[PDB]
Amino acid sequence: EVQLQQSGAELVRPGSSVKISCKGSGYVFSNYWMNWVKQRPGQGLEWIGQIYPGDGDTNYNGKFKGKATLTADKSSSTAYMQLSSLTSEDSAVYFCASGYLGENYVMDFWGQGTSVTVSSAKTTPPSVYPLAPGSAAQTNSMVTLGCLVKGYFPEPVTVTWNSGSLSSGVHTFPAVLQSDLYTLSSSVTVPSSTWPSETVTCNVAHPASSTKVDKKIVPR
Amino acid sequence: EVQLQQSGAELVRPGSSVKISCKGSGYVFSNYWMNWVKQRPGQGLEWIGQIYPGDGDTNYNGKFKGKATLTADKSSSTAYMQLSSLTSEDSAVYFCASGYLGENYVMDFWGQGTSVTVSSAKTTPPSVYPLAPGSAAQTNSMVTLGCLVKGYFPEPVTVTWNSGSLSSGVHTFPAVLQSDLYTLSSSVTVPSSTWPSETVTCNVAHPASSTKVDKKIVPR
Amino acid sequence: TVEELKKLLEQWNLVIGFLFLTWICLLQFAYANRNRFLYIIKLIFLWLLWPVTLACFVLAAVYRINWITGGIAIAMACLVGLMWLSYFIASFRLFARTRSMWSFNPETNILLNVPLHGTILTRPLLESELVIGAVILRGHLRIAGHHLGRCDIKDLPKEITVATSRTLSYYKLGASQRVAGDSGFAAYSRYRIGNYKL
Amino acid sequence: TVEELKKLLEQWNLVIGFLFLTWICLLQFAYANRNRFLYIIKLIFLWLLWPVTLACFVLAAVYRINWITGGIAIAMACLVGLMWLSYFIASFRLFARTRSMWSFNPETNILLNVPLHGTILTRPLLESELVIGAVILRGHLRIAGHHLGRCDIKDLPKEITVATSRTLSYYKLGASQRVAGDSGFAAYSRYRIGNYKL
Amino acid sequence: DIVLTQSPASLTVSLGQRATISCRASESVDSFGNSFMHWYQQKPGQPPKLLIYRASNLESGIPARFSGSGSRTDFTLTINPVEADDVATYYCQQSSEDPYTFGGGTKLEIKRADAAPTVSIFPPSSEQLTSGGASVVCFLNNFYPKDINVKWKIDGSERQNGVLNSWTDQDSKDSTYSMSSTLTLTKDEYERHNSYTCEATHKTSTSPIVKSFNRNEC
Amino acid sequence: DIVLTQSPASLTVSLGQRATISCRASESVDSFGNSFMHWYQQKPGQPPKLLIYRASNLESGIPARFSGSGSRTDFTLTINPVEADDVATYYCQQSSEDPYTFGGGTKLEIKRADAAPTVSIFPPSSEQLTSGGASVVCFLNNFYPKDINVKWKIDGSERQNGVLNSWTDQDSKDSTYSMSSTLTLTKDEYERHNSYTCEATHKTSTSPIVKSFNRNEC
Fold first, then answer.
1. Co-location of E136 and E92 in the same domain
2. Residue C70 near residue C64, CB atoms below 8 Å
3. Last residue of a domain, one of F55, F90, F111
4. What DSSP string runs through chain B?
5. Chains C and F: how many Cβ contacts under 8 Å?
6. Which of A58, A82, A185, A211 could form a disulfide with A69 if both were Cys (CB 3.0 to 4.6 A apart)?
């Protein structure tokens, strides 16, 4: 089973350089091509260049010629991409793909993606607040609860409920930027018999600031 | 890693029939040929016949035509050989072999072998006795010990010392038939400092009669 | 008798020029893998010139300048007759073993007869091998470097390889390997060279 | 003028019979994979009859019965000259791309140029494919069904496939798989069809 | 560089019908004996998934509902049965020349039955109050279509500033939408008024659904 | 049926020299373009191991010290370097006709330096005595060559019956032999005499090595 695993999240100041990693397992890494597809958060995909670890031959697109440098190491079975002279335009998600037969013109299996943010804003730990129907609890046929995550940077953040044991009726709303800080909301619905019989909790994981919060919610 | 595993030991009365099993793992069993090589204890190898599990095609030698029947099952990935009208001549060891590419004229990997004994003698549990230098212990530069296994049937029997932790200077002598019973001897040598500092033991395992003996030896 | 012999000589020069043109076209483009139409045309010329060659030799044998050219003409006639009958014998044995029209191709001497999905596909072979490899390469069977169609690892457990004289090799499936994609490795090893024809 | 014209007609009949015999031998056995000696012989006849065919056509053009056969002779002469120059152009481009003597074989239009252990082995190809499979089968490399020698999985990470006009495909190693034996699956996928010649 | 153009930029189809996506090209795409045209499917948060390669071959592991069409100037991706899991953005890519230019992208939408939104208003928590602020959040779940707006008023005074809206992508099970409107204000200004209500209007009904509360019962 | 004949039936070679094994055949072995001749190595207790297939190809996993020769009438297995682990029985097999007849088998022996046998006599145990018998065992370990005999006498009376000899196969480390001579007698008859001794003579010395004991010290 061939697969590709990249690094995590990268946050670098403008004018600096970043080195994205892509490695594969289950196949001869030296005989397979790379693609390094770039996708802006608002725009579509954009090809950058290819690299063959067997002989080090590298092909480029022309727009990224000099902006991106493709290097590979056969001993570690890992491919690298160096992005120098980074600006706010370079903030995008990069995917590395390869073919089943090792071809270069077909992209079969991809990576999970590497999000790169180019900004001068320092990381800020998220603040988690509970969201309950304080007025009268609205004990109707089906009542819903919520988890607010406000004031964090940068993206992304993972929100789950009771360690993933409640995946029904969950809606994780996308975050919106506000004064260099993101605000994210998540709403979940539960049967009126289950709440408040069992105290449910919303989990927040922010790897950029290492803020592991497990705040739980109760009636007023 | 392709491999072939057969059954254990078979002891059948003359005039009866036996069914030897041979199965393989790590390859498509339906596309590989069998050989079923027969080797007498005193004579050499002797080919019997081939079988192709994909279509059930069976080839024979002519001498075993009717004596041996080759059958295979694709669901269980196991090949079978039925030997009817057994006599004392049929007492031999049978090996099943196959090729790396699934060919029939080349035997690459074989099985551990299946010993078949055709006799009317009932199984007799082995009797284990110690063997020590009773006269004066002969405490010379290097003294040796022994383990006697007399009165068992049929072959084979496995003799080890202290669960295989003493494999240096060990000589397991072949057994000889005597009045329908076999007598086997095994001698081991140990440094004069080790004995009798640690009481060594000789292990005997006879799967035919399920006689597990762990008799240990001490000075007179 | 001066001008008419020259006129007929010019006609024969034009005729031999036309036959030279046909010879060059046959030797330059008439091949099975280059032009099927020209391949059939070359076969037709071979089949129609064999009896014409025999008749020309017997005509050059019945007439003679001396009893030297007659013996040479007889030798040429019997040699081409032997070649003719040998070619028919080989082609008839080939077409009795297999059921393909490739048996009459002088370019090929070894033929494959792999049936894929009920149709016996015939492809030429260059050498007779104990084991013949086969790759899939995303659902495109390529036994002996011959594209046969779309298939996966679940192939036919039998192959037959015919030759001009005897040599009806029988093969069977073996050594099946799969990859992350839709490719494969399963080859065919020969186990019998007997039971000729069908 | 009666008997000598008949005698020369008999000589021409014997000559045309001999040329028919050579034609039949060339069309029946003279092939690259059937008889190398006869293949070289057929090449020699082609190379020596091309200028002879051109000269015969110009001779049949300078003389005429009327101004109808002259135009036909001119057309045949220019057609065979065009074919001659086109064949030389194609062969010269082929021999400038690769470095093999197979460039002059009319039977083959696609050639492989795999170097195994320092020697560029040339094998004919029938079709141009995106990916070309390769099996080992106990240490006998069989790229495109062509036996090349003894090798194992540690192959050459490059292949080139030449054609008559442009089409210099470049391949690279990929999809390497091993088995319990000494066989393999590693194929070659094309990644560039540019940078012609060497 | 081939400039690939997709039409339409956004397409909506009823559940059970067929979808047709066309990708225009600047110049000829077919190479010598090959097309080198690919179609990719990308879900939000997931890497692109290859559907059709060479414009006529189905990718392994992909259901047989995807097919390709066109030759050397146009390429069409056809999905005869459409399912709730088929919502994504489809891209077209060419691999005949060195620049591997991608398509503009086509977002596929599913036309389903209208569903009334579920309005739930959540008053600010005490943790927010002791932190130094007060934010009220209104949740609208299980509604369709996308067109919806939220009206915020306090004590009869409609407010424009401080409200942030976040629309979720189409679900792969029931194909409904979810949106949240958060009004972040200061603590003192939050207690300067009396009533906080959330009014959500939708095309499914002429009367908007209202959720209201006060601070004198909490 | 091809009757394969091997010559010699048993071969001894010094350590470091080369071994040559020839396998005769009844009729022609080579088929149409192939030989179908195989060489196998079988150790005692282990299945046969293929060394050379088609009489000219080395088997994978086998050291390059094995080579094949001959064509269509004879086949020779050559081992240029011989090692202590090369002791086995070598067989030749043909696979050109339906009956896969095997060869007669050639046992390979290693010629090493002479070693004096180690003589150790073991008196019968009390467990044997209470079981109902009494058996004395003499052990001869680390000797070479095979030719050796044991003389059994009690109180000056040499005994022929009741002695069983068992020779072990050649070791793969020091290439020496081991043998055991067991004299199984009855308990009462065992105590009817006084002395029990084991005399082992070998070509390494004109004086045999003697081990003796009595029952009045045990």
1. no
2. yes
3. F111
4. --EEEE---EEE-TT--EEEEEEEESS-GGG-----EEE-SSS-EE--EEEETTTTEEEE-SSSBTTEEEEEETTTTEEEEEE-S--GGG--EEE--B-SSS-SS---B----EEEEE-SPPPB--EEEEE--TTTTT-SSEEEEEEEEEEEBSS--EEEEGGGT--TTEEEEEEEEETTEEEEEEEEEEETTTTTTS--BEEEEETTTTEEE--B----
5. 6
6. A82
Is the Cα torsion angle B24, B25, B27, B31 positive or negative in sign?
A: positive
Number of domain units in chain F: 2
A62, with CB counted inside 10 A (0-12, 13-18, 19+), is: exposed
Contact between chains at D13 and C129 (C-beta distance less than 8 A): no
Give the architecture-level CATH label for domain B127-213.
Answer: Sandwich (2.60)
Within 8 A of F100 by CB-CB distance, chain B residues are 35, 47, 61, 105
E and B touch per CB criterion (3+ pairs under 8 A): no
Contacts of D167 in chain E (CB under 8 A): 32
Q: Within 13 Å and on the Cβ side, how many CA atoms surround C181?
A: 27
Q: Domain check: are E98 and E158 in the same one? A: no
Helix-, strand-, coil-residue percentages of chain D, each rounded to 5: 45, 20, 35
C-chain residue closest to A108, CA distance: C181
Residues F29 and F71 in one domain: yes
Nearest-CA distance D127 → chain A (Å)? 19
Resolution rounded to one decimal, in angstroms: 2.7
Residues of chain F with Cβ-Cβ distance to C128 below 8 Å are: 33
Dihedral sign computed on CA atoms, order B132, B134, B135, B140: positive
Euclidean distance between CA atoms C93 and C108, whole angstroms: 14
**What's the DSSP call for residue D29?**
T
For testing the chain F interface, which of C109, C130, C164, C168 should be mutated: the one with the most F CBs within 10 Å?
A: C130
CATH for the B3-118 domain, from 1.10.443.10, 2.60.40.10, 3.30.70.1050, 3.30.70.1350: 2.60.40.10
Q: What is the token pair recorded at A205?
A: 């994981």
Let me know if the fold of A3-118 is the same as that of A127-213.
yes
Instruction: Tell me the nearest-neighbour CA distance from B107 into chain F, angstroms.
Output: 7
**Chain D contact for B136, CB < 8 A?**
no
Decide if F160 touches D, using CB distance below 8 A: no
Touch criterion met for A and B (3+ Cβ pairs within 8 Å): no
Could you count the other beta carbons within 10 Å of the beta carbon of residue E119? 19
Determine the Cα–Cα distance for residues E75 and E79; give it in Å rounded to an integer. 13
The two structure tokens encoding residue B122: 């009932």
Domain boundaries, chain A: 3-118, 127-213
Which residues on E lie below 8 Å from A171 (Cβ)?
Answer: 139, 141, 168, 178
Q: What phi and psi values does residue D96 have, to the nearest 5 degrees? A: -80, -30
Give yes or no: residues F133 and F175 share one domain: yes
Asked if D17 lies within 8 A of C69 by C-beta distance, the reply is: no
Q: Which residues of B touch C176 (CB under 8 A)?
A: 27-28, 31
Domain boundary among E111, E140, E170: E111
E5 to chain A, any CB pair closer than 8 A? The answer is: no
Beta bridge partners of F76: F22, F69
Boundaries of domain holding E188: 118-214
Nearest to E90 by CA among E107, E76, E65, E72: E107
The residue written with tokens 């539960």 in the block is A190
Do F74 and F122 lie in a common domain? no
Is C28 within 8 Å of D20 when comparing Cβ atoms?
A: no
- Please check whether residue C131 touches B, CB under 8 A: yes
Q: What is the CATH number of the domain that holds F67?
A: 2.60.40.10
Q: How far apart are CA F94 and CA F2, in angstroms?
A: 8
- Is C86 in the D-facing interface, judged by CB distances under 8 Å? no
Q: Does the CB of E64 have a partner CB in chain C at under 8 Å?
A: no
